């Protein structure tokens, strides 16, 4: 009960900050409240389907697929911060499947494209995803919430790769 409250206050504190300054770096001190929360993993990620993203990409050795996952998350985090930047890049409205970086990093993982739809790339074509032509601009609140969980999850996988997670034997599940 009171654990959920502390979790959601820190959540909005970092998301708001990331909405002020899209390029704002966050330290492990600022993120420790979300990583160290007693809440289960399924309850600490509200937009991103973290349970699936980890399990559905455990192929080969952990040293391999955990780096493959961390990379996809790092790129996805950039997709999110780009939509929040005061000067959004041109072509921000659509991501085409044959883009080299997306193909070899994000598309290479199950659930990568689902994260783009969370950002607002909901309209699907045979060549990629794109925003609805009707929507003028990103939902700044939704983008910031998704980016934080991508940033957060990548951080959990980094701690495990360093073998220093608050509850490492937990996510071993």
């Amino acid at each position: 009960g009171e654990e959920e409250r502390a979790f959601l206050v820190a959540r909005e504190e970092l998301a708001s900050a990331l909405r002020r300054d899209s390029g704002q770096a966050f330290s492990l001190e600022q993120l420790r409240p979300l990583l160290a929360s007693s809440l289960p993993l399924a309850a600490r990620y509200l937009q991103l389907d973290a349970a699936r993203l980890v399990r559905c990409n455990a192929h080969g050795e952990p040293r391999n697929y955990l780096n493959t996952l961390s990379t996809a998350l790092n790129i996805l985090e950039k997709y999110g911060r780009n939509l929040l930047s005061p000067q959004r890049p041109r072509y921000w409205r659509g991501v085409k499947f044959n883009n080299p970086v997306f193909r070899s990093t994000v598309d290479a993982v199950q659930g990568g494209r689902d994260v783009l739809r969370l950002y607002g790339y909901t309209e699907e074509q045979p060549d990629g995803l794109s925003f609805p032509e009707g929507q003028e601009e990103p939902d700044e609140h939704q983008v910031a919430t998704v980016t934080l969980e991508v940033l957060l999850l990548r951080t959990e996988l980094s701690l495990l790769l360093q073998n220093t997670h608050p509850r490492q034997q937990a996510l071993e599940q």
């Binding site: 890049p89 072509y91 659509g94 991501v95 085409k96 499947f97 044959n98 080299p100 970086v101």
Partner: peptide, 8 residues
Amino acid sequence: DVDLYTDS
């Protein structure tokens, strides 16, 4: 910066 969008 790195292009994450265009098919070309």
